[PDB]
Amino acid sequence: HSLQDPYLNTLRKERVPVSIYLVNGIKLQGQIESFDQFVILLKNTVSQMVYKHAISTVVPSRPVRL
Amino acid sequence: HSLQDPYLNTLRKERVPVSIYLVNGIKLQGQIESFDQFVILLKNTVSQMVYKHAISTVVPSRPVR
Amino acid sequence: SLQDPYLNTLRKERVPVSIYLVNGIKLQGQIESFDQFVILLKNTVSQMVYKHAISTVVPSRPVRLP
Amino acid sequence: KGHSLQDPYLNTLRKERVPVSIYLVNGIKLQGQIESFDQFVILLKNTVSQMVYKHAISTVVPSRPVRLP
Amino acid sequence: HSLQDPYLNTLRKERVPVSIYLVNGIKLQGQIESFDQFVILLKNTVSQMVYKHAISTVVPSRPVRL
Amino acid sequence: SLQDPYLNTLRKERVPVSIYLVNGIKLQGQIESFDQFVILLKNTVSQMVYKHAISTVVPSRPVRLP
């Protein structure tokens, strides 16, 4: 958890565009507005709450330094 | 946790129409009637119980908070 | 808990229900009993369904809500 | 109601050696009889004796009606 | 793990070749090198790490006794 | 556990790997870091992978097992 939090928090603070792929193959895009232990609030063309358990990978639009 | 609860509770109180997408791709629509640690009660024709573990995303029909 | 009182109402009232699995399959019958991890579904034949494999429980008619 | 239902149910199928079908979340249908089980897996006997993870199981359907204790 | 540990440990010790079916339908084959609470190390050309949560069934190539 | 030392070796030794997701997709790269729930993979694209979405981790060459 010592890696996930800083990573998501940095993406959030720096408003880094991200692509979030779900386990079912669907791709969501936007910026991370906030998150907690179980969900990620993604804002963009469509604001939405995403459950982490349904996420396979988070691919930042550019590398992030922690 | 700190975000999911306030978020769901807001959608509930404001009776905001939502779209709930399941991990299998199916889309449910209705209003959040109530929820607990493991389920969400989605109201429509009849209120159905959705297990959170089966949910991918919750998309509000309008801006909240 | 909201799940327990809800399932108990469906059980007590013997309400016909549809149980959708996470893989899209639809089961029909009535809730005979349940515990923390499974539900006993009675229909043409009885069967034990793991809750981790359930997506939604849809009653055939409105029922008292917890 | 932790395992108040699951344990007595699986144990009945086990002791009575009831033929059963176990459907997995991916759609596969396994057949045989429950040899034993613990909190996470089920040992299913058929052509061979295999270990099934409960997390991959959707439903357990007895070949015939069963009476719980 | 009253059954899981003894079972996997026997397969490991007897070096019994096994078929591991994943929840996505892919079939892996090899010998169990080791395992812990979350993963199993499956040896073949190279030893790959398999997450238990992705496993549906473990099928021994030949009968084993517990 | 086995997972940690195993992943740490692949990391410390910059071993190229293939991570197969529970949905079949194959990711390739080198493990940059990881914690209890995610693995940061890097190669052509950098990305955070949730362990719950991973089925197997396959090294490009044999490595010292834990």
Swiss-Prot record, chains C, F:
Presence of the UniProt keyword RNA-binding in the record: yes
Which part of the chain is the Sm domain? 4-63
GO BP annotations listed:
quorum sensing; regulation of carbon utilization; regulation of DNA-templated transcription; regulation of RNA stability; regulation of translation; regulation of translation, ncRNA-mediated
Cellular component terms, GO, for this chain's entry?
Answer: cytosol
Keywords of the record: RNA-binding, Stress response
The superkingdom listed in its UniProt entry is Bacteria
Q: Which GO terms describe its molecular function?
A: RNA binding
Quick one: signal sequence residues?
Answer: none
**UniProt keyword ATP-binding, yes or no:** no
Q: What does this protein do?
A: RNA chaperone that binds small regulatory RNA (sRNAs) and mRNAs to facilitate mRNA translational regulation in response to envelope stress, environmental stress and changes in metabolite concentrations. Also binds with high specificity to tRNAs.
How would you summarize the oligomeric state and partners of this protein? Homohexamer.
Family per UniProt? Belongs to the Hfq family.
Identification of the protein by name: RNA-binding protein Hfq
Per the UniProt entry, what species is this protein from, by scientific name? Pseudomonas aeruginosa (strain ATCC 15692 / DSM 22644 / CIP 104116 / JCM 14847 / LMG 12228 / 1C / PRS 101 / PAO1)
Organism phylogeny = Bacteria, Pseudomonadati, Pseudomonadota, Gammaproteobacteria, Pseudomonadales
* Annotated gene: hfq
